[PDB]
Amino acid sequence: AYVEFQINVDLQARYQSVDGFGCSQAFQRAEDIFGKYGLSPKNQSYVLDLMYSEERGAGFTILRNGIGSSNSSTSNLMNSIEPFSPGSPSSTPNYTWDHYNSGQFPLSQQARARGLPYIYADAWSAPGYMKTNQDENWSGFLCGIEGETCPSGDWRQAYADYLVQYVKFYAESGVPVTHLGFLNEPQEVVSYASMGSNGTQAAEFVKILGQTLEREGIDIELTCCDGVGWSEQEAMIPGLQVVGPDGKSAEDYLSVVTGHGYSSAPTFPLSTKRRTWLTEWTDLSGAFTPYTFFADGGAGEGMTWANHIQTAFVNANVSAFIYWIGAENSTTNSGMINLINDEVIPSKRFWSMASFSKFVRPNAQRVKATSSDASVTVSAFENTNGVVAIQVINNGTSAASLTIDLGKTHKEVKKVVPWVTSNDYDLEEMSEIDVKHNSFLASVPARSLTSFVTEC
Ligand SMILES: *[C@@H]1O[C@H](CO)[C@@H](O[C@@H]2O[C@H](CO)[C@@H](O[C@@H]3O[C@H](CO[C@H]4O[C@H](CO)[C@@H](O)[C@H](O)[C@@H]4O)[C@@H](O)[C@H](O[C@H]4O[C@H](CO)[C@@H](O)[C@H](O)[C@@H]4O)[C@@H]3O)[C@H](O)[C@H]2NC(C)=O)[C@H](O)[C@H]1NC(C)=O
Ligand SMILES: *[C@@H]1O[C@H](CO)[C@@H](O[C@@H]2O[C@H](CO)[C@@H](O[C@@H]3O[C@H](CO[C@H]4O[C@H](CO)[C@@H](O)[C@H](O[C@H]5O[C@H](CO)[C@@H](O)[C@H](O)[C@@H]5O)[C@@H]4O)[C@@H](O)[C@H](O)[C@@H]3O)[C@H](O)[C@H]2NC(C)=O)[C@H](O)[C@H]1NC(C)=O
Ligand SMILES: *[C@@H]1O[C@H](CO)[C@@H](O[C@@H]2O[C@H](CO)[C@@H](O[C@@H]3O[C@H](CO)[C@@H](O)[C@H](O)[C@@H]3O)[C@H](O)[C@H]2NC(C)=O)[C@H](O)[C@H]1NC(C)=O
Ligand SMILES: CO[C@H]1[C@H](O)[C@@H](O)[C@@H](O[C@H]2[C@H](O[C@@H]3CO[C@@H](O)[C@H](O)[C@H]3O)OC[C@@H](O)[C@@H]2O)O[C@@H]1C(=O)O
Ligand SMILES: *[C@@H]1O[C@H](CO)[C@@H](O[C@@H]2O[C@H](CO)[C@@H](O)[C@H](O)[C@H]2NC(C)=O)[C@H](O)[C@H]1NC(C)=O
Ligand SMILES: *[C@@H]1O[C@H](CO)[C@@H](O[C@@H]2O[C@H](CO)[C@@H](O)[C@H](O)[C@H]2NC(C)=O)[C@H](O)[C@H]1NC(C)=O
């Protein structure tokens, strides 16, 4: 039989596990979803379903929340649980919990109500009084870190205790945090919340925080360091791997190494022994590209992001992919879903994320998938429950007729369902295809993404 394009999936060649997909709603953008700029109650629930319902939407499984460093909630600041200095590092801190966290607490409740497992809390900065520059903004260093003393003393343990208290407020209010980070883009010196550290400076604090959590009996997965690009994060990993005089490295305490895609993209594997996450990335150009899956390779096009995701898993070995803002009242590409007062416009970047997230569920494993032609790129995952999800990007200008072989399985696959994303389709379910001897034929449209989902 003639075969235009051959795709081979091998469930016996298995790679990294998957924790999931999602976004952030930091810097008060969570409040947008709850009607800050006029979103109706109908569309508040619609947006939450698009984001977090596996049946009605993308079923995102990770939410990245900001641990606020600010002493007010003006402009788009995230306010802190410890807005004012206790005076000295050993003084008893005064903590305030507002059951809100710039809208991120009710958002977390709503995501969890729809099944979201993972909440990643990440600080952009320690509160300013803990830092060398006495300012949450413009970088600066945690007082007491190697090379960075402060006249007010050593604030390292105070910052660790502060992060523990943020996590405790969440758990006591019924919303446990599962992943915890204490830096964002430590390379960056910017006008908003920021804080520095190289690899060895980050490692120093990782060990302090991990030992604090063990003393407190809190089970949580520690991350580092949300570097501004993939290569920039890779450069911190040697410092995280130095085994100190106590016989431990920071990597021993870490569960996930995290990085962003801005300064360099996740296109190669990081050299840690831990799982890695792409934890922030978007199109910050200011363009507005809601409807385009492919036109000319613009940074905000749907295919661009379908390919960013597929590459991050296949070539950069990540276990999760977290966009920047999910939904926001803007007309730029910074968020996946544009809100225009009481109007909801999910972009093709959203639908590309949804194609992956709806069918590649937590604890899935990536498996080998190859393509006979460079115009068709493939990825494949086997879920806990046996469902196999195969993502195919056809960048040809014509439809492509695929022969897809699933190899040896321990129970023959009998049906598979395609779900297509393109200039014409958001996430459109096609007719089921019969599978014979673990092989099936399928045509995919020009310039498109298709998720093929097997039935158990
Ligand atoms: C599928 O196959 C197609 C070809 O058929 C490939 O399409 C090309 O994709 C590349 C990106 O990979 C495109 O190049 C990029 O174009 C962006 C959009 O340009 C439009 O808008 C600008 C405004 O300046 C117009 O001038 C232009 O004519 C277009 O209308 C640019 O914004 C990009 O620039 C950015 O990246 C470059 C390179 O790093 C930087 O130098 C820039 O400063 C900026 O940061 C870039 O030039 C290209 O246009 C596409 N070609 C065609 C014919 O469409 C897809 O890449 C491929 N997809 C996959 C997944 O393989
Ligand atoms: C909740 O959010 C939704 C989604 O954003 C809001 O509904 C949109 O409201 C805006 C205005 O606020 C409308 O924008 C107008 O669109 C006109 C063109 O609309 C046609 O083309 C659309 C492109 O696909 C299409 O979706 C739309 O179909 C919808 O409306 C038809 C007419 O009532 C109806 O027959 C369909 O079944 C479907 O409901 C039209 O064919 C344009 O000419 C205007 O200038 C303006 O831009 C959107 O059309 C609305 N979209 C939908 C799907 O309703 C909604 O108001 C928000 N609030 C509530 C309470 O629901
Ligand atoms: C892709 O990422 C995965 C993580 O998602 C990497 O998996 C890691 O692989 C290393 C092997 O090089 C495992 O380390 C080994 O651990 C055992 C004990 O568990 C130890 O005895 C060995 O000496 C070695 O340290 C590590 O466990 C594993 N991590 C996970 C979370 O499974 C994988 O290596 C990455 N692939 C590439 C090409 O980088
Ligand atoms: C539509 O507004 C968006 C801004 O255009 C966009 O720059 C961004 O601004 C945020 C800023 O986000 C950072 C983007 O770069 C990343 O490297 C970094 O980790 C992010 O923190 O964060 C600080 C905040 O003050 C800015 O408003 O996102 C805006 C948005 O709401 O989407
Ligand atoms: C509240 O936070 C603001 C912002 O970090 C603090 O103001 C900064 O203070 C430093 C140190 O004096 C200055 O270098 C910056 O210029 C200030 N920034 C701004 C925007 O004013 C302020 O000190 C904090 N207040 C309290 C009581 O902690
Ligand atoms: C919230 O979104 C609305 C709708 O996009 C914004 O209002 C528009 O703003 C642009 C300029 O940025 C104007 O061209 C439109 O005429 C405005 N429309 C309306 C109905 O006012 C609004 O500015 C956004 N607000 C925030 C804080 O982001």
Residue numbers in the entry: 18 to 473
Quote from the publication.
TcXyn30B is a bifunctional xylanase with endo‐glucuronoxylanase and exo‐xylobiohydrolase activities. The present study provides insight into the mechanisms of substrate recognition of a bifunctional xylanase.
The present study determined the crystal structure of the TcXyn30B‐product complex.
